[PDB]
Amino acid sequence: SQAWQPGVAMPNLYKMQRMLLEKCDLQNYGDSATLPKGIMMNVAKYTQLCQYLNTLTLAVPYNMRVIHFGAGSDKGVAPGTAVLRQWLPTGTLLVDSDLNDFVSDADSTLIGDCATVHTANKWDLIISDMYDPKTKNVTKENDSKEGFFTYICGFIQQKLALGGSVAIKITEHSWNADLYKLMGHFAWWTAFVTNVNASSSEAFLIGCNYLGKPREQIDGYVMHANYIFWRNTNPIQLSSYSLFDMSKFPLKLRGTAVMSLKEGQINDMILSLLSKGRLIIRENNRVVISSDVLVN
Amino acid sequence: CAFAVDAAKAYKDYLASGGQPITNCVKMLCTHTGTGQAITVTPEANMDQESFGGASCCLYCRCHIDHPNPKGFCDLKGKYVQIPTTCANDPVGFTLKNTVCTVCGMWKGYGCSCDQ
Numbered sequence: 001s002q003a004w005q006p007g008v009a010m011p012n013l014y015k016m017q018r019m020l021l022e023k024c025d026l027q028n029y030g031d032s033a034t035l036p037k038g039i040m041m042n043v044a045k046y047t048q049l050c051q052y053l054n055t056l057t058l059a060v061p062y063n064m065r066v067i068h069f070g071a072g073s074d075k076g077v078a079p080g081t082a083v084l085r086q087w088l089p090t091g092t093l094l095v096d097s098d099l100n101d102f103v104s105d106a107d108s109t110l111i112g113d114c115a116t117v118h119t120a121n122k123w124d125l126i127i128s129d130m131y132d133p134k135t136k137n138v139t140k141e142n143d144s145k146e147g148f149f150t151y152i153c154g155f156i157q158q159k160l161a162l163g164g165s166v167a168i169k170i171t172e173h174s175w176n177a178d179l180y181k182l183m184g185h186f187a188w189w190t191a192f193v194t195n196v197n198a199s200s201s202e203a204f205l206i207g208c209n210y211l212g213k214p215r216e217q218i219d220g221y222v223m224h225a226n227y228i229f230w231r232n233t234n235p236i237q238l239s240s241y242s243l244f245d246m247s248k249f250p251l252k253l254r255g256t257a258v259m260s261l262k263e264g265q266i267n268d269m270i271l272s273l274l275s276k277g278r279l280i281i282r283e284n285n286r287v288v289i290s291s292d293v294l295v296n
Numbered sequence: 297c298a299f300a301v302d303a304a305k306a307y308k309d310y311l312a313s314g315g316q317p318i319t320n321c322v323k324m325l326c327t328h329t330g331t332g333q334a335i336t337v338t339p340e341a342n343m344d345q346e347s348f349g350g351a352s353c354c355l356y357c358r359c360h361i362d363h364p365n366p367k368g369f370c371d372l373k374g375k376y377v378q379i380p381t382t383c384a385n386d387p388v389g390f391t392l393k394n395t396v397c398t399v400c401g402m403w404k405g406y407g408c409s410c411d412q
């Protein structure tokens with residue numbers, strides 16, 4: 001039983017299908033996990049996300065750079081950032097952003113639409129919880145959405161270091177075909193469902209070790225249909241079990257090497273080191289970010 | 297003109313009047329086998345403490361008002377604050393009303409043993 005895992009990743013055989021898109025109808029739709037006393041869903045959820053990320057070959061350089069989109073809550077704080085800061089090695093540079101105002105434990109916070117966010121440097125890890133509730137319209141076709149997903153695809157392509165990783169929240173209706181297609185530009189990818197929120201069609205699309213080029217061709221319409229089919233036929237038992245064992249939570253400080261290499265200089269030897277979580281390729285300059293402000 | 301908004305004093309008086317404390321402080325999952333010190337770089341609660349994200353327990357952070365010292369600096373933001381479990385219904389109140397021993401790192405009167 002997977003009730004003792006932090007969550008369930010999409011099995012590889014489901015990725016290889018060619019299903020057509022159906023409505024998502026979860027068996028455990030009504031249920032809820034009993035959270036430890038006084039723990040928020042967003043804390044439990046990010047904790048399980050990080051516990052699962054602990055099992056992947058994440059590159060963890062010195063002076064790791066992490067940016068977290070969609071980090072505000074309607075109550076004005078940043079629970080997910082607090083978990084990320086707990087998880088990431090001490091001294092990791094963590095940048096925060098959201099449309100609405102909030103206070104945060106991040107080293108720096110940018111308020112505004114994500115499309116107004118620009119950074120000079122590249123990043124080692126991109127986390128997104130962005131979600132527009134206006135997409136849960138059950139009465140029209142579920143097509144690929146753009147909005148913030150268009151920004152995210154561009155941001156990954158332009159500002160994710162080779163070897164870096166990504167976790168982008170999706171749901172039944174909040175998804176994007178190009179983002180799925182981008183998953184084929186990583187050494188490995190999955191859709192991860194946390195055990196505490198397994199009654200929701202939410203998942204985190206995780207791309208692990210960016211390679212900058214297609215490794216697989218992935219039709220993103222087919223793959224989201226596959227994801228829904230998996231969710232539809234695989235009820236996941238709600239569980240908060242993994243929340244009670246935090247002894248091995250911190251991300252393992254791997255000291256992963258950072259090099260500054262040029263596009264024609266990336267071997268199959270380099271590609272292979274990237275694939276193993278042993279190499280980050282980016283400049284190591286100072287981190288500079290800004291938010292575009294429209295004046296009247 | 298010596299006018300300075302005094303939010304610390306307004307909050308204490310709000311509590312005394314019987315007002316419900318500031319909510320939605322960000323409580324962390326942790327082992328509860330930690331050093332028990334007051335303000336730390338990662339959650340550090342012991343068996344009788346809860347650990348919270350710093351910014352969410354700072355009165356000034358939470359009210360969107362300036363921090364009371366010349367530099368604008370906040371010593372809670374980006375760290376974790378350990379709150380005695382019996383006071384965790386009001387972490388903002390707790391961090392305001394209490395002081396961190398400068399030699400052992402514990403809360404004076406809640407773990408600091410330096411005056412025994």
Ligand SMILES: Nc1ncnc2c1ncn2[C@@H]1O[C@H](CSCc2cc(C(=O)O)cc(-n3ccnc3)c2)[C@@H](O)[C@H]1O
Binds near residue numbers: 070073100130147
């Ligand atoms: N384009 C964008 N640029 C920058 N930030 C963006 C962008 N889009 C979204 N965000 C940010 O994502 C965060 C998490 S979604 C919050 C939410 C969830 C649910 C849910 O779960 O059902 C429901 C609601 N709701 C709204 C009204 N009645 C309910 C809200 C959030 O703080 C939001 O501002």
Ligand SMILES: [Zn+2]
Binds near residue numbers: 351357
């Ligand atoms: Zn503060």
Ligand SMILES: [Zn+2]
Binds near residue numbers: 397402409411
């Ligand atoms: Zn002391």
